[PDB]
Design a protein around this ligand. Sequence first.
Ligand SMILES: Nc1nc2c(ncn2[C@@H]2O[C@H](COP(=O)(O)OP(=O)(O)O)[C@@H](OP(=O)(O)OP(=O)(O)O)[C@H]2O)c(=O)[nH]1
Ligand SMILES: [Mg+2]
Lengths: 48, 201, 202
Amino acid sequence: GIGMNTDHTLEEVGKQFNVTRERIRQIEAKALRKLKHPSRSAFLKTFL
Amino acid sequence: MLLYTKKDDIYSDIVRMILLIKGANAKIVDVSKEENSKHLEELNIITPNGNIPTLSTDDFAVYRLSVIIEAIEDLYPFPPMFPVFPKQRANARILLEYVNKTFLQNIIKLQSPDLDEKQANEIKMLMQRDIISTYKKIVSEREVNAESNPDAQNINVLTLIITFVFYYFIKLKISIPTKDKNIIKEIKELLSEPNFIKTIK
Amino acid sequence: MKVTLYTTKYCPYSLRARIALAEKKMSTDIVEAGDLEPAMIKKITPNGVFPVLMEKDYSINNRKALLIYIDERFPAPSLLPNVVNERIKIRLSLDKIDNEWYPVLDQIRKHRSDQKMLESMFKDLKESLLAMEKAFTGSEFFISSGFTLADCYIAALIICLEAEGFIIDDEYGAIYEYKKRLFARDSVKKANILLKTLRTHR
DNA sequence: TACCTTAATAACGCCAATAACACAATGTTTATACAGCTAAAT
DNA sequence: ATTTAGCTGTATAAACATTGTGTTATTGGCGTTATTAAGGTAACTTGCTTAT
Ligand SMILES: Nc1nc2c(ncn2[C@@H]2O[C@H](COP(=O)(O)OP(=O)(O)O)[C@@H](OP(=O)(O)OP(=O)(O)O)[C@H]2O)c(=O)[nH]1
Ligand SMILES: [Mg+2]
């Protein structure tokens, strides 16, 4: 939920595509794995 | 997930633009086209007055532009056209209702081919007189909504509706009485938005 | 914090707002528009809307969105269905009642001056109620699993029609299943008037 | 400068449901290759 | 011409993707214990203090 009023749950996101209702969680996991790489992870590590 | 549309209809064009922002699967169907007479007859069976635009879904079928927009917002978690704050949402809803009653009804009446010259002239004059006030109110509401949340990345439906009304005013050939360069430049910038161009072309 | 509502006697929307406040269980101050000084009454609204409601920093005089605003402001049990499809259908049903209800109440109230004209309207209204009889059956308050705002809208019409001397329970067609149940809710039973009478009036 | 009582207020415990984790499992995606085809070669 | 090297093709393989499925977890709920407030009580002491 960034700039998102309701912080919609997985079911709402799955309905939004009309498909991939459980696929949304897998897509989020893949995105987290890609963003966890050092080139992006190292810069954001300083804040935490 | 099928929307019935009629060409040369302001409400239908606005619904199509809202779907384009969603980028959802919209199977546009033209009631006027003779290519799909059977589908138009099915729309008549489902809808008593055959109101257009009509959004059709297997679970339910809805009619009325405001109801259709609210239903689309509930259906999609895509960027919202409504404010996070309830008082702001209520004000936006009241403004949309006022704009629809004052201008949309006049546009629908002018659309008919049996219009009289006096009625058309009076409607055009009233629309020109209220256009500046409506635009000023919309800009003020947009600024107030933006102040509460920064970089929300949320698009306002009322601004899109005002842009569509201005485009219809240009198509009708009606003259806008604004002497301000700033207002003309802002209207041109709204007309130049890329997402709006896809429906217009 | 403190919220007050201004209402006009014999107004269906004002009754609907009062019922919604009772369901929300939020304490509020209710003031009759007539009691207020006429110049003071004009000052609150230049157009003059009897049902608006009162807040310290905000005022709403629009009945069409007033119920929706009241529901959004309070996070108490909602008057709208949780399911998205039911929520969409309920709004369409509310629009259907709002779009064409002027003839049912306004025309009879003012247009039907003749006693026969009121009688002529009554027969048509009874036939329309019978046609509505072949509709939802066994619904708790309507096409929803839980109490809904639309059920509140029906209460205002039922009380207003009863004030019009048109009371139908077993003569209103097969809609008796939900009519008795609606009065059961505490908020709905506030339409009209030894220790019990005094305590109730207090 | 007492008590407490009972009652009540407010904390707290427990329990449903549950959204979300989690894995599964495939069917997809991906990448792969190695391969018959193709470009260049000759 | 011939083939040869070039090209990766798309199946396949692998990886992903999707689906499903399990899990759990937390909200709600209920009751629950900590707490708490008020009422009541009646020898007698019936114009004060309070102060550079
Ligand atoms: N063609 C068309 N017209 C639309 C659409 N949406 C609204 N309208 C018209 O615009 C007018 C404003 O409607 P609303 O604002 O929704 O209802 P309101 O009259 O209570 O304000 C109405 O005229 P009205 O005479 O009040 O309508 P009715 O309610 O009396 O039938 C309605 O018929 C649409 O999608 N397509
Ligand atoms: Mg109307």
